[PDB]
Design a protein around this ligand. Structure first.
Ligand SMILES: Nc1ncnc2c1ncn2[C@H]1C[C@H](O)[C@@H](COP(=O)(O)OP(=O)(O)OP(=O)(O)O)O1
Ligand SMILES: [Mg+2]
Length: 1010
DNA sequence: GTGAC
DNA sequence: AGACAGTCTGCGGCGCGCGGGT
DNA sequence: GTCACGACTACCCGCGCGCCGCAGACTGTCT
């Protein structure tokens, strides 16, 4: 009948016979079990200590369907051969690059288009440079338009200059530089090259391009780190540079270089600093103001100077690249890294123009309408208050109005005449004067973020007025009788200095002391001070009634603060995007499919945005985007949060997308389970693999149900406990999730959870310090151990770490937590690169009509026509299973669990959102969007027209030419240092639950070693 | 300052 | 009719709190 | 009954507000 499931000694299911044969081929691991039996016993003991032995898991029928064959006897051979296939011929052009540079022409000619100069010959006019490799730089007049003005290119033989018609006697500034990227394969090298790519004429096509734009900044960051640890490590570099510039003498003996050697191997990200560091070139930056002008006649003069400046920039960039590139080849030697770098350097965003303009208009209009309306009333209140200065008796009794500086200076008199020398407001109180910045200002300025607002809005805490102090922040007065009682409420007294200042101010104003000052609590802790009382996390106190106001505008101010902060943060970046319409370039916007079959109706409003993506902008080799990878999600009360819904597909096309499930937790569990060689050998690995997302039995959901919070808050809590957070911070997090709890309750819960999770600690001379008795002790010990190696490498692809964070460059300020995080956060980049390479290979092999659109970390999307949508989903599933099998085989296990093999959901839609069934109603958008479609593996297999067709025979013939070289895995290199007796005794001690047993094992080891 | 020696 | 020494008067750079994302 | 350093989520982007160091114009004796 049906096939029977296969189960380990632990109740975990594996793949079926067909999937096993097509993925892992034939393998045998029977010989390890004889050594593994002791480990199994240890694992069994651990599983009995936490009560997970004999507990049932999820068992389902096996899945079997045919797959495309592999190109080697192992996954490493397959991936290396496909990487060499996808990396050519750009890799050959990157090498054999010229070293000597040709001479510069004496005079430049002003002529529209492309002009080529060859030493010894006359200048010529050309249509395209038509070169394999060039170095490129672009200049533009940004205050006039977004279109380029001039450009220069350098090759191995000649020089090229491109001039716009706008500076050659024209009134139309809309022009783009042509390079024939749709038919000629080429490599263009530049510094921040995306900004230059955005100004190329033939890049505005839905059909794929054939040019590779390479960036030196990403190579420099990935190689040298730039001390970009986002800690005052970055501050010490600037401080040391300031100290060196201040000193006019250079002593032979150097102080603080012994303590911090890494100060000598770092620079900044700007091109001038990189050139000064690597190539010792002093690059002057003075002419950059000439491109800030409004009149174009300025550019007509000083033409030769500007062209020479741009050519000097080109020369510096070439000399920097010729030194940077071999180092990058040395640190990252796997072809998949280069293929992923090429894949992530080409992205496109199709939009529409009128919708974008309407969205911008509404988003600005609502914001200004709210802001002006509230500010008018605040100014009116200030005007009414400032009129009573003539009666000292009325305001000297008010508890709030008595804290203002009611002092007036005399009017100056010069030679018995009016001086009239910049006197802003004579004979007025000081608090009123400070509102006006200068004499020209006629109306006082005020904002809800000002400091005197809790004085203008009479605020009370526990039915007591608030008092501003110098040393502390906001405080309130409690009489002597109840001082002990409020100590039961865990409030904290202020320091003695503020007490003395309060005493002297009350003696100056002429009253007697009746109590003491208590501090308003702060969310972070008792040490921090409170400075603002109208921000987030004070709304709950306003709802309860602890914070009270005598004015109705406090609640409206809180609403306005909650509603319009993200627009205030991102308006300038959102409104300054470069959008190119269809009506201006009618010969460019070509369709993805060759058989267009006309159908140009109702397509009169189309646009394309090219993002400015830095492929490697972090120490962990992640990509950086300032606008599109920092975009908010749609919310019911947030203005302008519908940004990502503005990306729309043209008629006849759609978006197919996916996102990886529980990514880095799975990687950490795999690292922890690699010691025992069996999936589920540790308690956390067994807890992670028991259920699936579709049944609502994942670890994040269970944590949320136990803690009584949402799933995102559970994700934060779980990712906070790992990477080294304390119990006090966990208690503060629990307080912030549920603000109705008591301090002791949260402390007890956090203490119990940390005791159950991590365990206890032991210090021994032989085995240093180690955790024991917990369900995640082995994982913590392994993560601590792998970060102290001499040459740290990524376990999957073998990428190296930056020079700034290596051991030999550090004697103090170890920066330990980043070195702990680095490997786990850097494995995701390799995951993404493998996924992209697999998708590119499948698309090229089976002639699908698809192209990558956007990749936000572990989320990816593709633009696919209506005919090949389910084939694209199938290719995504195959890529996922290949990547997971690669990860499992590299770490030493030749099996894969069935539950984690495939994506949970695959999304097909027409816009970009997080969930298909979202109306996306915002305060600025009043129209709902129809829902999309989401599919799992069984529903995908049930549908027709989802099967791949006939393949091309020549692709495999081209792939088979490349070579394969065997390499040894990273953990196998790591395991050579330790003797097996040390390992077995350490593993035996890590699973014990009492100090006496560990001491006995240490004594037995000491007796055995002799 | 605080669980471990 | 300058000389110059006090004597204010704003103006710009810097750090920090506070929000968005995986 | 002492003790010896431990202890610490991570990676990115950017704006408004208070604070302080200076460049510049204005009297006022002074020659
Ligand atoms: N506060 C955070 N701290 C550390 N890492 C985080 C944090 N938030 C997100 N990440 C990291 C860990 C994730 O594995 C990785 C991918 O992001 P994300 O998809 O949001 O988490 P996830 O994959 O575990 O949940 P899900 O299964 O719903 O996709 O980014
Ligand atoms: Mg995910």
């Amino acid at each position: 009948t049906a096939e029977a499931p296969r189960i380990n000694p632990v109740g975990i299911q594996y793949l079926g016979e067909s999937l096993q044969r097509q993925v892992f081929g034939s393998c045998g691991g029977k010989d390890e079990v004889e050594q593994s039996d002791k480990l199994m016993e240890l694992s069994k003991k651990s599983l009995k200590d936490h009560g997970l032995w004999g507990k049932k898991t999820l068992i389902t029928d096996p899945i079997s369907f045919p797959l495309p064959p592999l190109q080697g006897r192992s996954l490493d051979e397959h991936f290396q051969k496909i990487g060499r296939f996808n990396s050519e011929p750009y890799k050959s052009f990157c090498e054999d690059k010229f070293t000597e540079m040709v001479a510069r022409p004496a005079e430049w000619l002003r002529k529209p288009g492309w002009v080529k100069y060859v030493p010894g010959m006359a200048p010529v006019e050309v249509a395209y440079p038509d070169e394999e490799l060039v170095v490129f730089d672009v200049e533009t007049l940004y205050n006039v338009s977004d279109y380029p003005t001039l450009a220069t290119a350098l090759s191995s033989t000649a020089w090229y200059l491109w001039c716009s018609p706008f500076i050659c006697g024209g009134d139309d500034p809309a022009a783009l530089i042509p390079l024939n990227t749709l038919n000629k394969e080429q490599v263009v090298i530049g510094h921040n090259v995306a900004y230059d790519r955005a100004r190329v004429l033939e890049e505005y096509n839905f059909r794929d391009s054939k040019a590779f734009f390479l960036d030196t900044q990403s190579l420099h960051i990935a190689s040298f780190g730039l001390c970009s640890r986002q800690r005052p490590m970055f501050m010490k570099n600037n401080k040391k540079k300031e100290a060196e510039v201040e000193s006019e003498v250079h002593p032979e003996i150097s102080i603080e270089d012994y303590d911090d050697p890494w100060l000598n191997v770092s620079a900044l990200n700007s091109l001038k600093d990189v050139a000064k560091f690597h190539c010792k070139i002093d690059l002057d930056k003075t002419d950059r103001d000439f491109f800030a002008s409004t009149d174009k006649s300025t550019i007509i003069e000083n033409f030769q100077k500007l062209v020479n400046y741009c050519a000097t920039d080109v020369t510096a960039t070439s000399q920097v690249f010729d030194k940077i590139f071999p180092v990058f080849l040395k640190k990252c030697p796997h072809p998949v890294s280069f293929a992923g770098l090429k894949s992530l350097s080409k992205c496109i965003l199709p939009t529409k123009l009128n919708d974008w303009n309407d969205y911008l208009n509404s988003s600005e209009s609502l914001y200004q309408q709210s802001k002006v309306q509230i500010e008018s009333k605040i100014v009116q209140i200030i005007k009414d208050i400032a009129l009573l200065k003539d009666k000292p008796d009325f305001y000297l009794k008010d508890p709030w109005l008595s804290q203002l500086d009611w002092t007036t200076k005399p009017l100056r008199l010069t030679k018995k005449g009016v001086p009239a020398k910049c006197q802003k407001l004579p004979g007025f109180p000081e608090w009123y004067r400070q509102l006006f910045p200068s004499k020209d200002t006629v109306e006082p300025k005020i904002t809800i973020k000002s400091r005197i607002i809790p004085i203008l809005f009479k605020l009370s805490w526990e039915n007591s007025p608030v008092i501003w102090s110098k040393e502390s922040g906001w405080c309130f007065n409690v009489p002597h009788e109840q001082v002990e009682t409020y100590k039961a409420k865990n409030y904290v007294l202020a320091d003695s200095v503020s007490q003395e200042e309060e005493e002297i101010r009350m003696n100056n104003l002429g009253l007697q002391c009746t109590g003491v000052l208590f501090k308003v609590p702060h969310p972070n802790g008792p040490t921090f001070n409170c400075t603002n009382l109208l921000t987030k996390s004070y709304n709950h106190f306003f709802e309860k009634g602890v914070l009270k106001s005598e004015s109705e505008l406090a609640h409206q101010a809180l609403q306005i603060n909650s509603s319009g902060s993200y627009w205030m943060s991102a308006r300038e970046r959102i409104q300054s995007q470069f959008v190119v319409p269809n009506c201006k370039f009618p010969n460019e916007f070509q369709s993805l499919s060759a058989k267009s079959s006309l159908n140009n109706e109702k397509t009169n409003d189309l646009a394309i945005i090219i993002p400015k993506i830095v492929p490697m902008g972090t120490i962990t080799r992640r990509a950086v985007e300032n606008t599109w990878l920092t975009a908010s999600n749609a919310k019911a009360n947030r203005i302008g949060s519908e940004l990502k819904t503005q990306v729309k597909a043209p008629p006849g096309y759609c978006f197919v997308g996916a996102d990886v499930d529980s990514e880095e937790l799975w990687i950490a569990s795999l690292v922890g389970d690699s010691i025992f060689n069996v999936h589920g050998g540790t308690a956390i690995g067994w807890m992670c693999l028991e259920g699936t997302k579709n049944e609502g039995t994942d670890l994040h959901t269970k944590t949320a149900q136990i803690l009584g919070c949402s799933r995102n808050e559970a994700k934060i809590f779980n990712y906070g406990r790992i990477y080294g957070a304390g119990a006090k911070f966990a208690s503060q997090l629990l307080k912030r999730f549920n603000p109705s709890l008591t301090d002791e309750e949260t402390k007890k819960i956090a203490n119990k959870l940390y005791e159950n999770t991590k365990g206890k600690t032991k210090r021994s001379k032989l085995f240093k310090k180690f955790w024991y008795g917990g369900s995640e002790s082995i994982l913590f010990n392994k993560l601590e151990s792998i970060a102290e190696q001499e040459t740290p490498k990524t376990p999957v692809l073998g990428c190296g770490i930056t020079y700034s964070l290596m051991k030999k460059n550090l004697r103090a300020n170890s920066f330990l937590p980043s070195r702990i995080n680095w490997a786990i956060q850097s494995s995701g980049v390799d995951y993404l690169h493998l996924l992209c390479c697999s998708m590119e290979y499948i698309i090229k092999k089976y002639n699908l009509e698809a192209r990558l659109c956007i990749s936000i970390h572990d989320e990816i999307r593709f633009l696919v026509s209506e005919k090949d949508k389910y084939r694209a989903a199938m290719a995504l599933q195959i890529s996922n299973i290949w990547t997971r099998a690669m990860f499992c085989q590299q770490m030493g296990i030749n099996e894969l669990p069935q539950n984690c093999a495939f994506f949970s959901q695959v999304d097909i839609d027409s816009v970009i959102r997080k969930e298909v069934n979202m109306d996306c109603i915002t305060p600025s958008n009043k129209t709902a969007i129809p829902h999309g479609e989401a599919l799992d593996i069984n529903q995908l297999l049930d549908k027709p027209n989802s099967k791949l067709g006939k393949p091309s025979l020549d692709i495999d013939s081209k792939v088979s030419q490349y070579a394969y070289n065997y390499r040894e895995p990273v953990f196998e290199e790591y395991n050579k240092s330790y003797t097996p007796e040390f390992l077995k005794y350490f593993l035996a001690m890590q699973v014990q639950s009492d100090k006496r047993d560990v001491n006995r094992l240490e004594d037995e080891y000491l007796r055995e070693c002799t």
